Design an enzyme around this catalytic site. Structure first.
Site, PDB file in Angstrom:
ATOM      1  CG  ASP A 133      -1.883  -0.918   1.452  1.00 34.15           C
ATOM      2  OD1 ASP A 133      -2.554  -1.233   0.447  1.00 34.15           O
ATOM      3  OD2 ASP A 133      -2.086  -1.383   2.604  1.00 34.15           O
ATOM      4  CE1 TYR A 135       6.073   4.175   4.433  1.00 36.41           C
ATOM      5  CE2 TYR A 135       6.687   5.763   2.714  1.00 36.41           C
ATOM      6  CZ  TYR A 135       7.039   4.742   3.594  1.00 36.41           C
ATOM      7  OH  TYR A 135       8.341   4.301   3.667  1.00 36.41           O
ATOM      8  CG  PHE A 178       9.557   1.155   0.608  1.00 33.36           C
ATOM      9  CD1 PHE A 178       9.057   0.771   1.856  1.00 33.36           C
ATOM     10  CD2 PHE A 178       9.613   0.207  -0.431  1.00 33.36           C
ATOM     11  CE1 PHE A 178       8.605  -0.554   2.067  1.00 33.36           C
ATOM     12  CE2 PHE A 178       9.184  -1.115  -0.231  1.00 33.36           C
ATOM     13  CZ  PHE A 178       8.695  -1.494   1.021  1.00 33.36           C
ATOM     14  CG  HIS A 195       7.643  -5.328   4.296  1.00 31.88           C
ATOM     15  ND1 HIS A 195       7.883  -4.158   4.975  1.00 31.88           N
ATOM     16  CD2 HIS A 195       6.813  -5.011   3.272  1.00 31.88           C
ATOM     17  CE1 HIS A 195       7.230  -3.173   4.387  1.00 31.88           C
ATOM     18  NE2 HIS A 195       6.573  -3.662   3.348  1.00 31.88           N
TER      19      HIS A 195
HETATM   20 CL    CL Z   1       6.596   1.812   7.370  1.00 32.68          CL
END
Ligand code: CL
Length: 223
Positions: free
Chosen positions: A61, A63, A74, A184
């Site tokens: 997703d 942020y 990111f 992750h």
């Molecule tokens: Cl995060």
């Protein structure tokens, strides 16, 4: 030399895609706070054209807090606090890449300019609500994106972080493309195998082996 227009422009005419956009727009019109802003949704494609892709990094997703998402996985724009996932990405780079310095910002668009496709598998999210837009058709769209990269390019490096990204890349031809797996970088898994993965040096080794310029991972701010 092929562009996103050439390989996935057809998606515009797909019912699922039109219905995704219609849904997001209706949510916006209803007063739902949706990230990123509409103008940013497709930034990953704007900043890394199809033929320019060298490395693919997946997020899930965008942020979901204010001022964060800007259409690249990111990344956050300058001035915004570096989110926890990127904190760990930076910690890894500091150990992995000689002379890398942890920057005082979270802006990763200079990676995109070098051929790092910063793709979220879901391209919008409602504020404060993880996975809110998971089943809206975005995953169908980003499936088509990954299929286009798999079929119509050769020798890409895919950095697949976590189980969602690894499942997302399950059809990638592992002979024709170079897939690197780690957990992750979220604090929920970074310390259980992401830190130490050395993906950034490995990526550069693989690029150099192809005669392709390596990524300068040190992020640059606008000039
Ligand atoms: Cl995060």
């Amino acid at each position: 030399s092929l562009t996103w227009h050439d390989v996935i422009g057809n998606e515009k005419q797909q019912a699922y895609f039109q219905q995704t956009l219609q849904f997001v727009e209706s949510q916006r019109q209803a007063g739902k706070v949706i990230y990123p802003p509409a103008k940013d949704v497709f930034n990953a494609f704007r900043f890394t054209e199809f033929g320019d892709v060298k490395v693919v990094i997946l997020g899930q997703d965008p942020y979901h807090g204010p001022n964060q998402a800007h259409g690249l996985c990111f990344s956050v724009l300058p001035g915004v606090k570096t989110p926890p996932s990127l904190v760990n990405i930076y910690k890894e780079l500091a150990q992995d890449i000689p002379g890398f310095q942890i920057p005082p910002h979270g802006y990763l668009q200079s990676w995109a300019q070098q051929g790092v496709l910063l793709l979220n598998t879901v391209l919008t999210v409602e504020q404060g609500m993880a996975h809110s837009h998971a089943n809206t058709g975005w995953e169908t769209f980003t499936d088509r994106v990954i299929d286009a990269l798999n079929q119509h390019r050769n020798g890409l490096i895919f950095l697949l972080w976590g189980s969602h990204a690894q499942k997302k890349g399950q059809m990638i031809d592992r002979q024709r493309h170079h897939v690197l797996m780690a957990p992750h970088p979220s604090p929920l898994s970074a310390h259980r195998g992401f830190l130490g993965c050395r993906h950034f040096s490995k990526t550069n080794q693989l690029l150099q082996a192809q005669g392709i310029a390596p990524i300068n991972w040190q992020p640059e701010l606008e000039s």
